[PDB]
């Protein structure tokens, strides 16, 4: 589990989210495993804005925050799971490192902010799905 807190905005994985965040759905992509939902109060959190390709990842499954190197964001197969079919999920970053299920929304952050947060693994990789290009959580 996890979020991002930033203005009055909540950014969740789109397989996570509940009864609350659909209720007040600002935008959602299921190709992205994104969701994110209005809030009453303001948060504190910064997106990157940025092409770093280095960062820090939070692992509920290690207790432990794990330097990575991870790839750009690009469309990448995912095998079918509890809440998806096997399918391409876009918008995806992979670094070596590791990940269950129950890591999905663990924060991945740069020196600029937050990149993404935890939504895919296995194999020894962990997946990031990248909310920088979300511009709009900067404003209104
Ligand atoms: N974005 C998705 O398609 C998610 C949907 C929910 C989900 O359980 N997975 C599998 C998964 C995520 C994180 C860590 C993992 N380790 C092994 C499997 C695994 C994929
Ligand atoms: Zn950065």
Same mark, same amino acid.
């Given at each position: 589990?996890?979020? =991002?807190?930033?203005? +009055?905005?909540?950014?969740? +994985? /789109?397989?996570?989210?509940? @009864?609350?965040?659909?209720?007040?759905?600002?935008?959602?992509? *299921?190709?992205? &495993?994104?969701?994110?939902?209005?809030?009453?109060?303001?948060?504190?959190?910064? =997106?990157? /804005?940025? &092409?770093?390709?280095?960062?820090?990842?939070?692992?509920? *499954? /290690?207790? !432990?925050?794990?330097?990575? *190197?991870?790839? !750009?964001? *690009?469309?990448?197969?995912?095998?079918?799971?509890?809440?998806?079919?096997?399918?391409?999920?876009?918008?995806?970053?992979?670094?070596?490192? @590791?990940?269950?299920?129950?890591?999905?929304?663990? =924060?991945?952050?740069?020196?600029?902010?937050?990149?993404?947060?935890?939504?895919?693994?296995? +194999?020894?990789?962990?997946?990031?799905?990248?909310?920088? &290009?979300?511009?709009?959580?900067?404003?209104?």
């Amino acid at each position: 589990s996890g979020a =991002i807190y930033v203005g +009055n905005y909540r950014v969740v +994985n /789109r397989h996570l989210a509940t @009864h609350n965040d659909w209720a007040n759905l600002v935008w959602e992509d *299921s190709s992205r &495993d994104l969701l994110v939902s209005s809030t009453t109060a303001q948060g504190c959190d910064t =997106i990157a /804005r940025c &092409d770093c390709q280095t960062g820090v990842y939070y692992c509920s *499954s /290690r207790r !432990k925050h794990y330097p990575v *190197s991870f790839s !750009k964001p *690009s469309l990448i197969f995912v095998e079918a799971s509890e809440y998806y079919p096997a399918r391409y999920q876009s918008h995806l970053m992979l670094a070596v490192g @590791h990940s269950e299920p129950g890591d999905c929304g663990g =924060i991945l952050r740069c020196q600029h902010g937050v990149v993404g947060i935890v939504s895919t693994g296995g +194999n020894g990789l962990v997946g990031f799905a990248d909310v920088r &290009d979300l511009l709009w959580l900067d404003e209104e």
